[PDB]
């Protein structure tokens, strides 16, 4: 950020820029957003029981003092949110940045190196939500009924969009 804000002429020279940053002058936040972009970072959680204990993410700024982790990688770290402390490392060299961006990227490591079962799989909350969504409850509202002689089946719908629009009304249960 010093380099960028000297390049941007927000500070005359390096030491003036260092003073600029040490007091967190207001102008040094926008440049910060500029620099952090497209710079991978490794997140370790001790102990690193296995290879997936350290993964590279693309960092993003957040307000307050807390590394906002992605839930789906929680299992990979075995890191559960009640006071775990996750260390952050910053690759520098071009080789290191390539390595972090390519080999270590969290989205590039889904399957376990041990048994290959997916490790970014939904679990706990997400799995319950999906189980509730995709399960079938006979006798629910808006069910299908093939009765004839008085009216049509009244269970079919033209398109899924129609189905959602009906569910918005208190007619069709999901």
């Amino acid at each position: 950020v010093m380099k960028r804000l000297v390049d941007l002429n927000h500070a005359q020279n390096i030491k003036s820029a260092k003073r600029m940053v040490e007091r967190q002058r207001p102008q040094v936040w926008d440049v910060l957003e500029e620099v952090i972009a497209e710079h991978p970072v490794l997140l370790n959680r001790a102990p690193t029981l296995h290879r997936l204990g350290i993964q590279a993410f693309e960092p993003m700024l957040v307000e307050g003092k807390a590394i906002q982790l992605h839930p789906l990688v929680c299992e990979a770290f075995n890191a559960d949110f009640d006071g775990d402390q996750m260390a952050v490392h910053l690759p520098l060299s071009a080789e290191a940045q390539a390595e972090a961006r390519i080999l270590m990227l969290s989205s590039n490591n889904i399957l376990s190196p041990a048994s290959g079962r997916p490790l970014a799989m939904p679990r706990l909350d997400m799995v319950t939500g999906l189980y509730y969504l995709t399960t079938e409850v006979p006798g629910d509202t808006g069910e299908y009924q093939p009765a004839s002689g008085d009216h049509p089946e009244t269970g079919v719908y033209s398109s899924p969009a129609e189905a959602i629009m009906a569910a918005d009304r208190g007619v069709l249960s999901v």
Binding site: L49, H50, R51, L111, S112, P113, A114, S115, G116
Partner: protein, 104 residues
Amino acid sequence: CYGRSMATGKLVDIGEAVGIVAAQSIGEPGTQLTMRDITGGLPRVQELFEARVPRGKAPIADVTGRVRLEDGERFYKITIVPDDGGEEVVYDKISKRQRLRVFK
């Protein structure tokens, strides 16, 4: 010969350190590897990879032959007449309390 990389989902590369991956994969289920004398837990794993003679060393068949188990408390004697061969071997001190592993 190694086979497919389990993580990448395709064949292995020509620089992968499969040794470290192997070892870490063996060790990772530690702790969650619980137990319920011959060991059967993490100590048992350690023994297997340590080549340590197990506590409950059950005798094993050596040469095909009719068996002439004799009755010795903590010291079962076990004779086996070799089908072709030399001389039947008796095992002076074998534990009686064990239970003979089933055969054909």
